[PDB]
Design an enzyme around this catalytic site. Sequence first.
Site, PDB file in Angstrom:
ATOM      1  N   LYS A  22       0.842  -1.181   0.000  1.00 35.43           N
ATOM      2  CA  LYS A  22       0.000   0.000   0.000  1.00 35.43           C
ATOM      3  C   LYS A  22       0.886   1.241   0.000  1.00 35.43           C
ATOM      4  O   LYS A  22       0.532   2.247  -0.609  1.00 35.43           O
ATOM      5  CB  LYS A  22      -0.892   0.030   1.241  1.00 35.43           C
ATOM      6  CG  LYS A  22      -1.802   1.245   1.296  1.00 35.43           C
ATOM      7  CD  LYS A  22      -2.643   1.283   2.574  1.00 35.43           C
ATOM      8  CE  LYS A  22      -1.767   1.346   3.810  1.00 35.43           C
ATOM      9  NZ  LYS A  22      -2.552   1.616   5.042  1.00 35.43           N
ATOM     10  N   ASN A  23       2.038   1.165   0.677  1.00 34.08           N
ATOM     11  CA  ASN A  23       2.950   2.310   0.761  1.00 34.08           C
ATOM     12  C   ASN A  23       3.620   2.684  -0.558  1.00 34.08           C
ATOM     13  O   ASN A  23       4.284   3.720  -0.644  1.00 34.08           O
ATOM     14  CB  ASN A  23       4.007   2.090   1.854  1.00 34.08           C
ATOM     15  CG  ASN A  23       3.397   2.068   3.242  1.00 34.08           C
ATOM     16  OD1 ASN A  23       2.345   2.668   3.475  1.00 34.08           O
ATOM     17  ND2 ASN A  23       4.057   1.389   4.175  1.00 34.08           N
ATOM     18  N   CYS A 115      -3.485  17.071  11.592  1.00 40.94           N
ATOM     19  CA  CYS A 115      -2.609  17.101  10.417  1.00 40.94           C
ATOM     20  C   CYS A 115      -1.491  18.101  10.709  1.00 40.94           C
ATOM     21  O   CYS A 115      -1.759  19.268  11.014  1.00 40.94           O
ATOM     22  CB  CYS A 115      -3.395  17.532   9.176  1.00 40.94           C
ATOM     23  SG  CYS A 115      -2.391  17.609   7.663  1.00 40.94           S
ATOM     24  N   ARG A 120       6.232  21.949  11.049  1.00 43.23           N
ATOM     25  CA  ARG A 120       7.665  21.828  11.291  1.00 43.23           C
ATOM     26  C   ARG A 120       8.358  23.137  10.907  1.00 43.23           C
ATOM     27  O   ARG A 120       7.839  23.901  10.093  1.00 43.23           O
ATOM     28  CB  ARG A 120       8.256  20.695  10.443  1.00 43.23           C
ATOM     29  CG  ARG A 120       7.747  19.295  10.770  1.00 43.23           C
ATOM     30  CD  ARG A 120       8.358  18.255   9.827  1.00 43.23           C
ATOM     31  NE  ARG A 120       8.087  16.887  10.261  1.00 43.23           N
ATOM     32  CZ  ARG A 120       6.892  16.300  10.209  1.00 43.23           C
ATOM     33  NH1 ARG A 120       5.840  16.955   9.728  1.00 43.23           N
ATOM     34  NH2 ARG A 120       6.742  15.060  10.662  1.00 43.23           N
ATOM     35  N   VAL A 122      10.772  23.456   9.116  1.00 41.14           N
ATOM     36  CA  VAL A 122      10.968  23.272   7.680  1.00 41.14           C
ATOM     37  C   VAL A 122      10.155  22.069   7.202  1.00 41.14           C
ATOM     38  O   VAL A 122      10.607  20.925   7.324  1.00 41.14           O
ATOM     39  CB  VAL A 122      12.444  23.008   7.301  1.00 41.14           C
ATOM     40  CG1 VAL A 122      12.544  22.762   5.795  1.00 41.14           C
ATOM     41  CG2 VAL A 122      13.319  24.199   7.692  1.00 41.14           C
ATOM     42  N   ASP A 123       8.954  22.325   6.685  1.00 36.39           N
ATOM     43  CA  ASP A 123       8.104  21.254   6.163  1.00 36.39           C
ATOM     44  C   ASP A 123       8.673  20.969   4.787  1.00 36.39           C
ATOM     45  O   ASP A 123       8.659  21.839   3.916  1.00 36.39           O
ATOM     46  CB  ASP A 123       6.653  21.721   6.043  1.00 36.39           C
ATOM     47  CG  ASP A 123       5.740  20.633   5.537  1.00 36.39           C
ATOM     48  OD1 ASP A 123       5.897  20.226   4.364  1.00 36.39           O
ATOM     49  OD2 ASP A 123       4.876  20.172   6.319  1.00 36.39           O
ATOM     50  N   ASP A 305       9.148  -0.671  10.911  1.00 37.05           N
ATOM     51  CA  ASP A 305       7.877  -1.366  10.725  1.00 37.05           C
ATOM     52  C   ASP A 305       7.945  -2.881  10.986  1.00 37.05           C
ATOM     53  O   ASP A 305       6.916  -3.553  10.949  1.00 37.05           O
ATOM     54  CB  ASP A 305       7.288  -1.105   9.331  1.00 37.05           C
ATOM     55  CG  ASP A 305       6.670   0.275   9.210  1.00 37.05           C
ATOM     56  OD1 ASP A 305       6.493   0.967  10.243  1.00 37.05           O
ATOM     57  OD2 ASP A 305       6.352   0.661   8.070  1.00 37.05           O
ATOM     58  N   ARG A 397      -6.758  -2.327   7.863  1.00 44.15           N
ATOM     59  CA  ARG A 397      -6.352  -1.198   7.039  1.00 44.15           C
ATOM     60  C   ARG A 397      -4.948  -1.301   6.441  1.00 44.15           C
ATOM     61  O   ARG A 397      -4.643  -0.618   5.459  1.00 44.15           O
ATOM     62  CB  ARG A 397      -6.552   0.100   7.831  1.00 44.15           C
ATOM     63  CG  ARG A 397      -8.031   0.301   8.148  1.00 44.15           C
ATOM     64  CD  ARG A 397      -8.358   1.651   8.730  1.00 44.15           C
ATOM     65  NE  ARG A 397      -9.793   1.795   8.961  1.00 44.15           N
ATOM     66  CZ  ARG A 397     -10.341   2.800   9.631  1.00 44.15           C
ATOM     67  NH1 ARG A 397      -9.575   3.752  10.141  1.00 44.15           N
ATOM     68  NH2 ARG A 397     -11.649   2.855   9.796  1.00 44.15           N
TER      69      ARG A 397
END
Length: 419
Positions: A22-23, A115, A120, A122-123, A305, A397
Amino acid sequence: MDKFRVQGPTRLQGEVTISGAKNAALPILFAALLAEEPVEIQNVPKLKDIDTTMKLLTQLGTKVERXGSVWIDASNVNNFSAPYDLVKTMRASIWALGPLVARFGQGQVSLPGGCAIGARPVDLHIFGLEKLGAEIKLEEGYVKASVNGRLKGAHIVMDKVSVGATVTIMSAATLAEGTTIIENAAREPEIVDTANFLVALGAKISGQGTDRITIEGVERLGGGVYRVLPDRIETGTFLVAAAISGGKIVCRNAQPDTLDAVLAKLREAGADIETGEDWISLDMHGKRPKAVTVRTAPHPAFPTDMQAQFTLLNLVAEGTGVITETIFENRFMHVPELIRMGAHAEIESNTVICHGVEKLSGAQVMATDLRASASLVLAGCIAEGTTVVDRIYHIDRGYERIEDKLRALGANIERVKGE
């Protein structure tokens, strides 16, 4: 609230077919917004975020439908705004921004509560698009982007490695004028897969998989057929399932090179592993695993993960082993749950000292993190008695029909509806 009632102990053995990641499917689906011609994305798992993404793309003017594949026709995209009601359940929605501004000169995505876009100092999504020439505004619950004309290639140095922003910048750069060089780029296999998808549409990208990605912009991207790569985390989850239960398993539709660190760690645990072009076999020959040392770090190093799964492995292994997190330093909610199942462990700072026991005991457990939850199901399979894992929608999910897959491996599992 659905739960999984598991009866153990059961050896998990046999074969399992790994689903698409999915990623990788998500960034590829958003990257498809750049395609002027039909695209067929194959091996896409049937998971909620995929449906949410399809509904969002449709709202943008994309024609979409699915089964094993998701068929996309973004030729007529004509609405450049991702609304609150269509993004509130999925942070991946941010990936619509780059493609929209790059192909149509404007775009905006709603930012729901929780969200963190723009929070941050620096996004990187914002920084990258700004470096490419876009003007970014954070107003009225939206992040908005715009550019007069086309984006322009730039030498962009990411101050932190970010899979999310690497996708955004790389995708948008495919239609920028000139060359873009992304330094300190995320090296995850899903980045590589997204890059190869873009190339399949006609993009010019090299270096994917390394810390530096170079994109030579083109005027437009066409269409094509692309198969999403296997889910390396689902693969590791099933390899662990066999490793903690004395079994032998063959994972089909796998990609061994996405798991170098994981396979090496399983060999240290005593696993007999073999690999082919599209499969991985693991055989414990009926033996209990040996405790190992695990340290998470950015890909290609050991993945966070898979950390909960290897914690479980150490908790039933021979000897004391340590799990160290350098990515998510407090990602240990599975530990207190496993302790109620008889596991012996101490959480110290960003590490878990594991003292392996011969057999766990069933208990009622729950973890909100997807990998932790899946690990608890695996624990139930090998524990003595009945284990009830609550809130398994979290697993639903991120894993495609894990119940069916585990049952085919010998698990005694039942989905129960609210107590």
